[PDB]
Amino acid sequence: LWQRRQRRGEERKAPEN
Ligand SMILES: N#Cc1ccc2c(CN3CCOCC3)cc(-c3ccc([C@H]4CCC(=O)N4)cc3)nc2c1
């Protein structure tokens, strides 16, 4: 679920913020 875009500064689940 969470913990993937922390590595991009995007945090979590969105279809591109
Ligand atoms: N929590 C969370 C979470 C969970 C899934 C996510 C998925 C789909 N999953 C499907 C399963 O395999 C890994 C991808 C895509 C994206 C995502 C895709 C592209 C970008 C664009 C714009 C920003 C950038 O650098 N790229 C930003 C965010 N963010 C997600 C965030």
PDB file of N, CA and C and ligand atoms in Angstrom:
ATOM      1  N   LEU A   1       0.855  -1.237   0.000  1.00  0.00           N
ATOM      2  CA  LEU A   1       0.000   0.000   0.000  1.00  0.00           C
ATOM      3  C   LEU A   1       0.871   1.260   0.000  1.00  0.00           C
ATOM      4  N   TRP A   2       1.222   1.708   1.190  1.00  0.00           N
ATOM      5  CA  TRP A   2       2.054   2.883   1.380  1.00  0.00           C
ATOM      6  C   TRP A   2       3.544   2.526   1.208  1.00  0.00           C
ATOM      7  N   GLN A   3       4.426   3.460   1.537  1.00  0.00           N
ATOM      8  CA  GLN A   3       5.890   3.246   1.497  1.00  0.00           C
ATOM      9  C   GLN A   3       6.509   2.887   0.139  1.00  0.00           C
ATOM     10  N   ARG A   4       6.244   3.722  -0.861  1.00  0.00           N
ATOM     11  CA  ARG A   4       6.880   3.570  -2.173  1.00  0.00           C
ATOM     12  C   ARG A   4       7.322   4.836  -2.782  1.00  0.00           C
ATOM     13  N   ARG A   5       6.617   5.942  -2.627  1.00  0.00           N
ATOM     14  CA  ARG A   5       7.081   7.106  -3.220  1.00  0.00           C
ATOM     15  C   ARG A   5       7.910   7.958  -2.295  1.00  0.00           C
ATOM     16  N   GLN A   6       8.217   7.419  -1.139  1.00  0.00           N
ATOM     17  CA  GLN A   6       9.123   8.038  -0.164  1.00  0.00           C
ATOM     18  C   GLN A   6      10.501   8.222  -0.771  1.00  0.00           C
ATOM     19  N   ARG A   7      10.681   7.410  -1.784  1.00  0.00           N
ATOM     20  CA  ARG A   7      11.899   7.263  -2.534  1.00  0.00           C
ATOM     21  C   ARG A   7      11.936   8.193  -3.716  1.00  0.00           C
ATOM     22  N   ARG A   8      10.866   8.948  -3.822  1.00  0.00           N
ATOM     23  CA  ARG A   8      10.708   9.990  -4.874  1.00  0.00           C
ATOM     24  C   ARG A   8      10.237  11.353  -4.343  1.00  0.00           C
ATOM     25  N   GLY A   9       9.719  11.352  -3.127  1.00  0.00           N
ATOM     26  CA  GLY A   9       9.165  12.554  -2.503  1.00  0.00           C
ATOM     27  C   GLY A   9       7.677  12.664  -2.798  1.00  0.00           C
ATOM     28  N   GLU A  10       7.115  11.566  -3.254  1.00  0.00           N
ATOM     29  CA  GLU A  10       5.714  11.468  -3.647  1.00  0.00           C
ATOM     30  C   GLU A  10       4.826  10.778  -2.627  1.00  0.00           C
ATOM     31  N   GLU A  11       5.478  10.279  -1.595  1.00  0.00           N
ATOM     32  CA  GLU A  11       4.793   9.650  -0.436  1.00  0.00           C
ATOM     33  C   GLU A  11       4.061   8.320  -0.755  1.00  0.00           C
ATOM     34  N   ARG A  12       2.801   8.422  -1.167  1.00  0.00           N
ATOM     35  CA  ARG A  12       1.960   7.256  -1.387  1.00  0.00           C
ATOM     36  C   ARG A  12       0.862   7.391  -2.440  1.00  0.00           C
ATOM     37  N   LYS A  13       0.249   6.240  -2.685  1.00  0.00           N
ATOM     38  CA  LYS A  13      -0.819   6.043  -3.689  1.00  0.00           C
ATOM     39  C   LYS A  13      -1.568   7.259  -4.236  1.00  0.00           C
ATOM     40  N   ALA A  14      -1.198   7.611  -5.450  1.00  0.00           N
ATOM     41  CA  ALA A  14      -1.845   8.644  -6.249  1.00  0.00           C
ATOM     42  C   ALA A  14      -1.524   8.289  -7.654  1.00  0.00           C
ATOM     43  N   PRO A  15      -2.363   8.721  -8.573  1.00  0.00           N
ATOM     44  CA  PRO A  15      -2.018   8.550  -9.961  1.00  0.00           C
ATOM     45  C   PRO A  15      -1.295   9.791 -10.485  1.00  0.00           C
ATOM     46  N   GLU A  16      -0.105  10.025  -9.926  1.00  0.00           N
ATOM     47  CA  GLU A  16       0.725  11.243 -10.137  1.00  0.00           C
ATOM     48  C   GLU A  16       0.050  12.389  -9.355  1.00  0.00           C
ATOM     49  N   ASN A  17       0.762  12.981  -8.404  1.00  0.00           N
ATOM     50  CA  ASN A  17       0.162  14.034  -7.575  1.00  0.00           C
ATOM     51  C   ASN A  17       0.243  15.382  -8.295  1.00  0.00           C
TER      52      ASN A  17
HETATM   53  N1  LIG B   1       1.729   3.993  -1.631  1.00  0.00           N
HETATM   54  C1  LIG B   1       1.687   3.837  -2.777  1.00  0.00           C
HETATM   55  C2  LIG B   1       1.634   3.647  -4.165  1.00  0.00           C
HETATM   56  C3  LIG B   1       1.205   2.440  -4.692  1.00  0.00           C
HETATM   57  C4  LIG B   1       1.155   2.260  -6.068  1.00  0.00           C
HETATM   58  C5  LIG B   1       1.529   3.296  -6.928  1.00  0.00           C
HETATM   59  C6  LIG B   1       1.504   3.149  -8.318  1.00  0.00           C
HETATM   60  C7  LIG B   1       1.077   1.808  -8.990  1.00  0.00           C
HETATM   61  N2  LIG B   1       1.939   0.652  -8.519  1.00  0.00           N
HETATM   62  C8  LIG B   1       1.424  -0.624  -9.096  1.00  0.00           C
HETATM   63  C9  LIG B   1       2.254  -1.818  -8.537  1.00  0.00           C
HETATM   64  O1  LIG B   1       3.663  -1.657  -8.873  1.00  0.00           O
HETATM   65  C10 LIG B   1       4.173  -0.432  -8.408  1.00  0.00           C
HETATM   66  C11 LIG B   1       3.346   0.777  -8.962  1.00  0.00           C
HETATM   67  C12 LIG B   1       1.885   4.235  -9.107  1.00  0.00           C
HETATM   68  C13 LIG B   1       2.280   5.433  -8.501  1.00  0.00           C
HETATM   69  C14 LIG B   1       2.817   6.600  -9.315  1.00  0.00           C
HETATM   70  C15 LIG B   1       3.091   6.430 -10.667  1.00  0.00           C
HETATM   71  C16 LIG B   1       3.725   7.438 -11.382  1.00  0.00           C
HETATM   72  C17 LIG B   1       4.095   8.632 -10.773  1.00  0.00           C
HETATM   73  C18 LIG B   1       4.880   9.615 -11.694  1.00  0.00           C
HETATM   74  C19 LIG B   1       4.979  11.163 -11.418  1.00  0.00           C
HETATM   75  C20 LIG B   1       5.859  11.255 -10.217  1.00  0.00           C
HETATM   76  C21 LIG B   1       6.915  10.235 -10.713  1.00  0.00           C
HETATM   77  O2  LIG B   1       8.121  10.220 -10.403  1.00  0.00           O
HETATM   78  N3  LIG B   1       6.357   9.312 -11.511  1.00  0.00           N
HETATM   79  C22 LIG B   1       3.768   8.829  -9.431  1.00  0.00           C
HETATM   80  C23 LIG B   1       3.137   7.819  -8.706  1.00  0.00           C
HETATM   81  N4  LIG B   1       2.310   5.523  -7.169  1.00  0.00           N
HETATM   82  C24 LIG B   1       1.945   4.513  -6.388  1.00  0.00           C
HETATM   83  C25 LIG B   1       1.998   4.681  -5.009  1.00  0.00           C
END
